């Protein structure tokens, strides 16, 4: 819920303030992990993989909540990991149908001297 | 999300059983399965192959099989479907 | 599905594209040398011969114009093994021309691959080959030129078979014609135009006629060697491209087969643990 | 189909205890587990893995081990067992 504490504290500044906000959010795996472990201590069976079964509503409702309203808009980046390399877990794929945009960030642009490390290829 | 594609469906059978033509569009139905397993897991059900119902057959069968088209004599109605699918690696 | 035996095929198709991509490494190396002493030795003394023959007149007045009935192929192809596809167009042209007609060649093949391939189909046929080449130079070609000489004398005309190296990713198959020591020497003595007397005559034919021969020779090895190097470097693209496209199809199945692992596992645990 | 094993094993101790010489041939199984298996989950038994009981083990393992060479105290017989078991996809 550490997540959706950030996210409230922008909701304020939507709202009320009206203003645009950037909401920066850590890897989203420890979020949907951290779901996952909450439902295995209450006793919920696990998903196929060990999530949780309320993966599509625990992670849908962050995703809705995140949008741009007639008062302000929240904008989220918030980094990806990809659990052993699989983009097709669970949590990466549920988690691209809502984004819109990637930033793949690159260690071999910053060895040539430029320091974006934004990929303009891989980057969509 | 269970429940949404059926009551769409109800909403489209309306045309078809009055003679009518209607086109319902299913967006992608792999978010309806991940409902309805959610559901079901939390039943405490045994879970298949997949961690999917055994059922999820049914489930998705009984909705598309009430689309269809209706002979002249009961209005000549029809009921298109076109059920969408994501595919995580295009398998 | 057995993940144990996925992951293990998948290794072996890494190591496949490994060594498939480091042949190709050396394909390119071993292409700058041959094509660097091709641009040196090309076009050497080729076709002075034939040029001279064409401006002695009184040759052409008394030239034997005949068509040759019994002639002599010499198909030209590498002897290393995944070199490419140009051993098997060389051997695939010369089958045709062969199999149309038999009796009226001798097929002397040059090249492992070449006599090999053209063995079983031809048995007979071709009684003696030319492999193991240390290297190319004249000398050598010469060698080779003197023995088809020697082996020349029983068809009225001498043909070679090899790639032409046009391009470094162009290889077109290029065949020359060459007329045997019987018709040289008959047609030499006409020479005229050119005196001849520091060396005489009868021996300036003999000599010359290997200039002829093992000019196309020595040109024709070359040219085959760099189109070998050529299209072994090609290859070894395509097969280093096919060998990861076909591993990272894989990896996608072993993904797979390691959620369904995950699932298949947690599920026992959940239904011992049910109860 | 569990005790079907055992029972024809039985008919092949008599020509063994007989100084007899028996050849008996148990078919696939496999099969034979997913009826114990059948048997023991239809009991309320806690299933292991792959939904098998625990002591699976133990049911080949007490039927082929009976087969063997009497001394020829006994009268010098012997079982011969030769087991079959299919595979899924050879693996």
Request: net charge positive; aromatic share 8%; glycine share 6%.
């Amino acid at each position: 819920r550490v997540g959706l504490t950030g996210l409230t504290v922008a909701e304020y500044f939507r709202d009320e303030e009206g203003k645009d906000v950037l909401l920066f959010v850590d890897n989203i795996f420890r979020f949907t992990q951290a779901c996952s472990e909450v439902s295995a201590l209450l006793g919920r069976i696990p998903s196929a993989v060990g999530y949780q079964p309320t993966l599509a509503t625990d992670l849908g409702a962050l995703q809705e909540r995140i949008t741009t309203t007639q008062k302000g808009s929240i904008t989220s980046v918030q980094a990806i990991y990809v659990p052993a390399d699989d983009l097709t877990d669970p949590a990466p794929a549920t988690t691209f149908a809502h984004l819109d945009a990637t930033t793949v960030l690159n260690r071999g642009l910053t060895e040539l001297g430029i320091y974006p490390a934004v990929d303009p290829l891989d980057s969509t | 999300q269970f429940l949404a594609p059926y009551s769409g469906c109800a909403i489209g059978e309306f045309f078809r059983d009055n003679g009518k033509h209607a086109l319902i569009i299913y967006d992608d139905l792999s978010k309806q399965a991940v409902a309805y397993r959610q559901m079901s897991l939390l039943l405490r059900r045994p879970p298949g192959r997949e961690a999917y119902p055994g059922d999820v057959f049914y489930l998705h069968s009984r909705l598309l099989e009430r689309a269809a088209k209706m002979n002249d004599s009961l209005g000549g109605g029809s009921l298109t479907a076109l059920p969408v699918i994501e595919t995580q690696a295009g398998d | 599905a057995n993940l144990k035996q996925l992951k293990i095929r998948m290794k072996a198709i890494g190591s496949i594209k490994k060594i498939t991509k480091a042949m190709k490494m050396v394909a390119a190396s071993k292409m700058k040398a041959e094509t660097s002493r091709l641009e040196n030795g090309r076009n050497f003394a080729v076709g002075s011969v034939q040029k001279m023959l064409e401006n002695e007149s009184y040759v052409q007045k008394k030239k034997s114009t005949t068509a040759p009935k019994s002639t002599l192929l010499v198909p030209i192809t590498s002897d290393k093994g995944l070199c490419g596809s140009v051993n098997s167009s060389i051997v695939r042209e010369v089958k045709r021309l062969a199999l149309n007609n038999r009796s009226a060649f001798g097929l002397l093949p040059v090249g492992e691959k070449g006599s090999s391939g053209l063995s079983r189909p031809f048995p007979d046929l071709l009684k003696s080959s030319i492999v193991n080449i240390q290297n190319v130079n004249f000398p050598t070609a010469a060698a080779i030129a003197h023995q088809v000489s020697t082996q020349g004398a029983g068809y009225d005309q001498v043909t070679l078979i090899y790639n032409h190296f046009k391009n470094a990713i162009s290889y077109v198959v290029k065949h020359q014609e060459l007329l045997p020591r019987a018709q040289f020497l008959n047609l030499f003595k006409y020479v005229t135009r050119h005196e001849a007397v520091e060396p005489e005559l009868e021996y300036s034919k003999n000599y010359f006629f290997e200039l002829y021969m093992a000019s196309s020779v020595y040109n024709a090895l070359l040219n085959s060697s760099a189109s070998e190097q050529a299209s072994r470097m090609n290859a070894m693209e395509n097969a280093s491209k096919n060998a990861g496209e076909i591993l990272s199809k894989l990896t996608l199945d072993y993904n797979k087969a390691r959620q369904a692992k995950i699932t298949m596992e947690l599920i026992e645990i959940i239904s011992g643990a049910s109860i």
